Write a protein that binds this ligand. Structure first.
Ligand code: HEM
Ligand code: HEM
Ligand code: XFN
Ligand code: XFN
Ligand code: CL
Ligand code: CL
Lengths: 362, 362
């Protein structure tokens, strides 16, 4: 019944895809070719056109994403041809370079060979292609706590981190047939980072905060027409709150709010002073200012919500149902100042889409 | 089948209520009495003990309420004895006085006679017992836009507002048998208001903002054991964000953020400046400071969330399932700084509870 699931997904995808591409007349013959191919080989192979539009539809269907207005301009890189670790490594390096684009970030996805029969051809261990290591031992915490398990796994493979608060994790991935993943250090010339300063508060630089330019999610599966692309890293540019209200502020992440309060010169003693809220706003102002000053793409949550409003309007105008997850779409700073907060969204799952998958380590 | 719905709700309520009250042995005889009474009269009458605990359970089951830690100290006033408009009016005046308690607010509910056969005995028109009128005509907007329809209805009944931004609406309610509601002006001596000032920014008083002390919801139905108390106004004290991030900030309410930005001396020109977020924090700081300075009860969203965490713990320790609506429980200012944001809640409906009902006017 594996094949029947595949055939059914394929039928729905090809019909929808070709309809959007004005290719509806070709659906008939294409599906026949696909049915023979499944009968024969147990699977089928997407055309470049199908793969590209599939990855775009998958972004368009991502309920939790506020950035979807730009779904149709996704840059899709087809790497279904890779067979070696060196090719995978080089393709990941290339993704970083071309997505970064000297700071003018290009939303990009690199697509590797798909699962054959649930059997991965390439298995990426990183959560993002660029991320900081984390350490916790003898009560001492260093770096990003979110990376502790992956960092420990890396250090089992012969890697060693410098134990700064911002060590770049190496790329780590496993090839079909290999028992152990390989790891490769990131060339620093490929990785843009932004030091965090504040537009008005000179002392903010005393915190010595920085973040990386481009979030490149590398642990999710792209599913298109029943084909499972478990290895298909993708990136956008950041919304500022992701850095300033989550990565740097969260108590289980960099946990910087008390330090922020101190450098902006407010007490951190009384809940009624709303010092956490004030620190959050100033940290978030600093993040946006810093990315802008450096010429690295970023969007603030107000502008992002306005773009998302246009996405909603575009969907209605195209006759497409809109799906969304309110709990993820609202920004974590002043959510009620956005239109998103004041409406509801159908959280139904539509494919093609991106999905969570089990981690290959613990 | 009306009766069967009633009997079934009654059975579940009485069993649960008496169990919590350590009265489980009396459930048997009480249910027999109730069954006879329903057979006879089509309904049944709660004991004072049942009514009081029922209203408390209803608060405890209110999924959208962050204030539930204090459910068991609700002050329940039994006014099932009222028969005249003067008695209803006087009971509403009394509720305001005793709930206000010179600023040390007491969570209180006044319970009027229940619906007989869907037939209301008392029909309250106000959304809250204390609220400001709103006007919109010839492009001119005055007061609270949320009150526009009710205000227009009042002005059909012979009332006239002064058309300040803070006119107190009169009490308005209808008795069974009467075609028209009556209205009564609130004695100003009963109504505490708080002028909004900022702890550090002297100019904030130039905005001439104020709000009323006590939110007394008067348009919801209390349902206990199948009995429908459509008229049962209840109050708590405010959480500061309700005033500073909703009532005064919302574009469809008092819409004060641009004016706040001006008095705190920041530009309101660029989304990336996060001026709306900064204005929201300062307005919210001002609200808490002002209520505290005046000696009127209020809670900030951090303290409220910590209290709610204790409510969760208390529920687990008592063996009670917890229900909640994440979308209402998170505060609209720095939600991710509260524990609520980082967990999920079962939004199932448990009775006794408070419910929306159709408005008696348009
Ligand atoms: C172009 C700039 C982009 C911005 C500003 C953006 C913004 C965001 C934000 C802020 C979130 C997380 C919301 C939260 O934590 O509550 C998110 C989630 C997501 N975005 Fe986007 N995004 C962008 C591009 C992309 C692209 C190119 C894709 C894929 C092709 C994508 C797919 C997703 C997915 C799948 C999630 C959910 C991840 C999960 O469930 O863990 N986004 N986006
Ligand atoms: C003691 C102080 C109290 C505080 C601070 C408090 C806090 C709140 C807040 C902030 C909300 C709205 C959340 C939002 O808009 O997202 C709310 C909703 C609610 N509260 Fe409470 N509350 C308190 C007391 C009470 C009492 C005494 C009752 C009833 C006996 C009650 C029942 C409710 C109900 C029914 C709602 C939802 C209203 C609706 O659906 O429109 N609360 N509470
Ligand atoms: C492609 C892309 C671009 C872009 N700018 N941002 C993303 C999302 C990045 C992201 C990364 C992590 N580690 C966690 C979350 C959600 C954290 C989270 C967790 C839970 C549980 C709830 C919630 N609201 N948010 C989101 C993807
Ligand atoms: C007894 C009691 C005490 C206390 N402190 N606060 C309340 C709630 C008062 C309240 C009043 C109004 N008008 C609207 C909302 C919800 C506004 C709202 C609407 C929607 C649609 C979503 C959302 N999250 N919030 C809440 C009751
Ligand atoms: Cl991130
Ligand atoms: Cl209110």
């Amino acid at each position: 019944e594996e094949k029947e699931i595949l055939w059914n997904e394929a039928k729905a995808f090809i019909a929808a895809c070709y309809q959007e591409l004005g290719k509806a007349a070709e659906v008939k013959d294409r599906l026949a070719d696909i049915k023979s191919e499944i009968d024969l080989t147990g699977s089928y192979v997407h055309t470049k056109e199908e793969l590209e539009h599939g990855a775009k539809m998958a972004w368009r269907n991502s309920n939790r994403c506020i950035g979807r207005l730009f779904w149709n301009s996704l840059n899709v890189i087809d790497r279904r041809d890779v067979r070696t670790k060196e090719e995978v490594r080089d393709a990941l390096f290339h993704h970083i370079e071309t997505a970064t684009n000297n700071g003018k970030i290009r939303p990009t996805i690199t697509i590797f060979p798909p699962e054959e029969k649930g059997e991965k051809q390439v298995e990426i261990w990183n959560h993002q292609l660029i991320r900081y290591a984390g350490y916790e031992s003898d009560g001492e915490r260093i770096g990003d706590p979110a990376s502790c398990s992956l960092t420990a796994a890396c250090e089992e493979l012969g890697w060693r981190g410098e134990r700064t608060d911002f060590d770049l994790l190496p790329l780590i991935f496993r090839m079909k047939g290999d028992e152990q993943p390989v790891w490769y250090e990131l060339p620093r010339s490929l990785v843009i980072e932004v030091p965090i300063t504040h537009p008005d508060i000179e002392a903010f630089s005393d915190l010595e905060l920085k973040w990386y330019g481009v979030p490149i999610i590398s642990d999710m599966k792209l599913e298109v027409g029943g084909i499972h692309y478990n290895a298909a890293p993708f990136n956008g540019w950041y919304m500022g709150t992701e850095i300033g209200a989550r990565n740097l502020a969260d108590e289980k992440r960099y946990d910087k709010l008390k330090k922020v309060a101190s450098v902006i010169g407010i007490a951190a003693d009384y809940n009624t002073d709303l010092w956490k809220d004030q620190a959050l706003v100033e940290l978030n102002k600093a993040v946006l200012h810093s990315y802008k000053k450096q010429g690295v793409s970023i969007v603030d949550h107000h502008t992002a919500a306005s773009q998302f409003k246009r996405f909603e309007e575009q969907a209605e105008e195209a006759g497409r149902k809109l799906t969304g997850d309110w709990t993820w779409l609202i920004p974590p700073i002043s959510p009620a100042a956005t239109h998103i907060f004041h409406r509801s969204y159908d959280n139904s799952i539509v494919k093609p889409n991106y999905f969570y998958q089990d981690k290959p380590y613990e």
